[PDB]
Design a protein around this ligand. Structure first.
Ligand SMILES: Nc1nc2c(ncn2[C@@H]2O[C@@H]3COP(=O)(O)O[C@H]4[C@@H](O)[C@H](n5cnc6c(=O)[nH]c(N)nc65)O[C@@H]4COP(=O)(O)O[C@H]3[C@H]2O)c(=O)[nH]1
Ligand SMILES: Nc1nc2c(ncn2[C@@H]2O[C@@H]3COP(=O)(O)O[C@H]4[C@@H](O)[C@H](n5cnc6c(=O)[nH]c(N)nc65)O[C@@H]4COP(=O)(O)O[C@H]3[C@H]2O)c(=O)[nH]1
Lengths: 240, 240
């Protein structure tokens, strides 16, 4: 319900009733080498359950509240990294990117935790990339404050591969759809080889998303990709 | 006015009141060597003035008349090829592939001109690709009749690069935007290079569309592309 979701999300944003979940992202050659943990937002509904980002993000956007989540989540993430030595990754939404106020606030916050710059990567989903202009300032600002930037769910937008060279990303997360059952339909290899060849040529490591299978894993590994992540390595779970 | 166009096209379509224009498609490494000529449709209006396909095609679509153009153009093109020995290229519209009747008529026509098979390439623009099934049903069909198929305005669907080898297409015409001012905007090279790497591996020659500039030509040529077309080599003109 537009107003069930509306009361719930507004209250949740205000009391900061969001939980941090994590999923390990690991080296392809060694699934015991942890590259970072990808932070996932979980919503606490009063009638019990933990609700996944996938279920609530759609409404956050419909209400234009996404930037609030972003702020909340970044403050929480930075806070919680004080407890360990692990590298983390977290999304930024197009909404934050579009509001100069929100975006400044974010830089404000990063400047306050400059110590953590080398342990937190910020991520944008392909489906909400801003202009290459915006991406360029974004990385300049971030690099100055010691933080790295990455892109994810790539790439329907593969034609921008060369634009990315000038951005010095930490890595590129490939949409899992491009590796789904790859071991089973070698059809999909040509495209992956292309990304892998191009990206390697500008020193940008590739991470394969949503790997569900040993078969999928063994081909990704073999084609020479750097990282993997997915249900093969477990459900997203609270800090451990 | 939407009204004026309805009557013009229906009338001109009925009267077969169209002119074939041509634009040469030429080797990247020798712009004097003509790979083939692309047939361009030109509407004659009431005063004998020509209207380019670019302007009138959107209306054939709205009025659902593209299959009419297709049949009329195909017949004329097959007719005029009898007067020379040059190779030609001609678009089929999605509307035809989707109309089983129109499509069989197209096959009946082709079948009636087996002898021209090796000199006529049919083209589908990327914007109007049918589903993979239709593409392959179409490829086996033309093949048995001697005719070959190609794709144009390509680049946005590079992720389908793996599905292309089983088609034995004649060539891939790369959409001009991936080429535009490539000599200034060198961001564009990595994508092109990637397309050319995959195209080499499936033995599918590339042709760059709408090349306007010696700088573009020079870059395209250096990257190994087979062919080029565009205003650099002159405007579209009647056979003469
Ligand atoms: N089919 C399949 N799915 C898998 C597999 N492995 C993990 N997943 C799921 O797909 C999403 C993966 O995380 P993500 O790539 O960061 O994708 C994320 C991320 O891009 C975004 N998101 C999550 N948290 C935040 C946040 O705090 N802020 C922003 N702006 N976006 C967020 O929404 C997505 C999260 O949705 P989730 O519901 O948490 O769902 C997660 C996860 O539950 C797999 O092997 N197969
Ligand atoms: N800016 C720029 N433009 C250039 C350049 N070189 C050529 N052009 C123009 O772009 C189009 C090129 O032909 P096309 O790629 O086959 O693209 C064609 C073709 O796909 C299609 N078309 C034309 N005739 C037919 C037809 O008889 N049947 C069907 N189904 N489609 C047709 O519509 C397009 C033709 O529209 P046109 O008005 O003829 O416009 C032509 C041409 O005038 C350049 O260097 N720069």
């Amino acid at each position: 319900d537009h107003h069930a979701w509306h009361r719930l999300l507004d209250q949740a944003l205000n009391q900061r009733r969001f939980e941090l979940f994590f999923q390990p992202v690991v080296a392809a050659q060694d699934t015991q080498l942890v590259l970072h943990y990808k932070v996932l937002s979980r919503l606490l509904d009063e009638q019990g359950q933990t609700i996944p980002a996938g279920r609530f993000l759609p409404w956050l956007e419909r209400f234009g509240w996404t930037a609030r989540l972003d702020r909340l989540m970044l403050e929480r993430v930075l806070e919680q990294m004080a407890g360990h030595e692990e590298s983390l990754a977290l999304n930024l939404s197009s909404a934050t990117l579009a509001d100069p106020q929100a975006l400044n606030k974010v830089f404000e916050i990063l400047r306050a935790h400059s110590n953590l710059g080398a342990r937190l990567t910020l991520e944008i989903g392909e489906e909400q990339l801003p202009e290459q202009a915006v991406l360029e300032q974004l990385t300049r600002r971030l690099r100055e404050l010691g933080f790295s930037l990455s892109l994810q769910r790539f790439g329907g937008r593969f034609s921008m591969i060369g634009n990315l060279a000038r951005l010095g990303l930490a890595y590129l997360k490939i949409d899992g759809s491009y590796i789904r059952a790859i071991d089973q339909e070698s059809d999909k290899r040509l495209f992956i080889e292309a990304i892998q060849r191009a990206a390697h040529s500008i020193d940008l490591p590739l991470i394969a998303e949503r790997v569900e299978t040993e078969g999928e894993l063994s081909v990704i590994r073999e084609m020479g990709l750097y990282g993997v992540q997915g249900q093969l390595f477990g459900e997203p779970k609270p800090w451990g």
